[PDB]
Amino acid sequence: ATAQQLEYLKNSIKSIQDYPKPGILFRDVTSLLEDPKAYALSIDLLVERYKNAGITKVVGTEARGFLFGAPVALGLGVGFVPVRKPGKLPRETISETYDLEYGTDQLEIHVDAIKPGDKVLVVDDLLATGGTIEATVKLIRRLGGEVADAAFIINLFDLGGEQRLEKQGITSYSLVPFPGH
Amino acid sequence: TATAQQLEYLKNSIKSIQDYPKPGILFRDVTSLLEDPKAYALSIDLLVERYKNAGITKVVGTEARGFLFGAPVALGLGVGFVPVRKPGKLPRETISETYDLEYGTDQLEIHVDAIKPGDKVLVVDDLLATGGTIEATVKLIRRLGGEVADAAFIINLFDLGGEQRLEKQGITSYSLVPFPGH
Ligand SMILES: [Cl-]
Ligand SMILES: [Cl-]
């Protein structure tokens, strides 16, 4: 990306000081979604990064993930595979648990959606702890998918997510870096 | 408009699951269309072609399956995408509308700043069933001064009365794949 493209994307994102709490600056991708140029540019740069990488499927987690994975799948000309909250997918699934503050949640994937020989790109809005992406990489590999790549609009470089994913053999590509926890 | 062959390709791309989510029902599963790059691209390209001269200034999609169809149509039209979300997910000032579900009610929210007077909105969703969520979405759009006359769907469950419900709001529905049942 050019410095002009990267600053336009940074400037398209609203930061809500002390949302959802004091000291937390929420990075709001909805202002990017509503801007024709910023949204298109975010998708075009991700497609350009992966066009030669032999990607055969794009995975996006529910729900903001869908907004960036699905357009990147269409731009690469490959299928889109949703990873969802429990009880929403209708065919055979597998499930992975990830930790939150005061408990856990689960993500599910269709078992038939990823096959051995598939090379998968994960795409999400924002890299924070990386917990959800770590669980998504576990789902993909349980299905025999190869995954080495995760792409983000925003990376919160203070929260350790990139290094967490590197422990799984994931290289992260992020358009907009922001500080804050 | 869409060719008969294109419509048959889209209809054949959608899996039907016997006795899900309850016995005697045939669940129309759009995830098989998402997985097929030809069917997914064809669906998006057709919806963009249908509305390319309609003066659309914004596309609205409801969480979550709606995002998979409305956001690519927004990019094809080269207009902004505005999500309508389940409560407590949008971080800035919202308004809310209540709608009916099988076992009660729930709300959808929109950012108050996302639609303005002069906006002409296309609503895009995966599937037209009762139409309750789209009815609520149309109310949100019009509360903000947006015009909305058009909703587009991948699937229309024509037995469930959705299209006629949306006609009572002045909405014309366009759907790619009709199915009987629920
Ligand atoms: Cl949001
Ligand atoms: Cl509906």
Swiss-Prot record, chain A:
Record carries keyword Transferase: yes
Origin: domain of life: Bacteria
EC number: 2.4.2.7
InterPro entries hit by this protein: Ade_phspho_trans (IPR005764), PRibTrfase_dom (IPR000836), PRTase-like (IPR029057), UPRTase/APRTase (IPR050054)
Disulphide-bridged cysteine pairs: none
Keywords in alphabetical order: Cytoplasm, Glycosyltransferase, Purine salvage, Transferase
Keyword Cytoplasm: yes
GO cellular-component term (any): cytosol
Pathway listed: Purine metabolism; AMP biosynthesis via salvage pathway; AMP from adenine: step 1/1
Swiss-Prot/TrEMBL catalytic activity: AMP + diphosphate = 5-phospho-alpha-D-ribose 1-diphosphate + adenine
GO terms classed as biological process: adenine salvage; AMP salvage; purine ribonucleoside salvage
Compartments reported by the entry: Cytoplasm
Gene Ontology molecular function terms on file: adenine phosphoribosyltransferase activity; magnesium ion binding; protein homodimerization activity
Coiled-coil blocks: none
Assigned protein family: Belongs to the purine/pyrimidine phosphoribosyltransferase family.
Subunit structure of this chain's protein: Homodimer.
Function (record text): Catalyzes a salvage reaction resulting in the formation of AMP, that is energically less costly than de novo synthesis.
Protein name: Adenine phosphoribosyltransferase
Organism: Escherichia coli (strain K12)
Lineage: Bacteria, Pseudomonadati, Pseudomonadota, Gammaproteobacteria, Enterobacterales
Swiss-Prot record, chain B:
Organism superkingdom: Bacteria
Pathway the protein contributes to: Purine metabolism; AMP biosynthesis via salvage pathway; AMP from adenine: step 1/1
Annotated PROSITE patterns: PUR_PYR_PR_TRANSFER
EC number: 2.4.2.7
Pfam family of the protein (one): Pribosyltran
Gene Ontology molecular function: adenine phosphoribosyltransferase activity; magnesium ion binding; protein homodimerization activity
Subcellular location: Cytoplasm
One biological process term in Gene Ontology: purine ribonucleoside salvage
Keywords recorded for this protein, A-Z: Cytoplasm, Glycosyltransferase, Purine salvage, Transferase
Disulfide bonds: none
Predominant place of localization: cytoplasm
Enzyme class: transferase
Catalytically driven reaction(s): AMP + diphosphate = 5-phospho-alpha-D-ribose 1-diphosphate + adenine
Keyword Cytoplasm assigned: yes
A Gene Ontology cellular-component term: cytosol
NCBIfam families (UniProt xref): apt, PRK02304.1-1, PRK02304.1-2, PRK02304.1-3, PRK02304.1-5
Function of the protein: Catalyzes a salvage reaction resulting in the formation of AMP, that is energically less costly than de novo synthesis.
HAMAP family for the chain: Aden_phosphoribosyltr
Record text on subunit structure and interactions: Homodimer.
Family according to the record: Belongs to the purine/pyrimidine phosphoribosyltransferase family.
Protein's name in the database: Adenine phosphoribosyltransferase
Species of provenance: Escherichia coli (strain K12)
This protein's encoding gene: apt
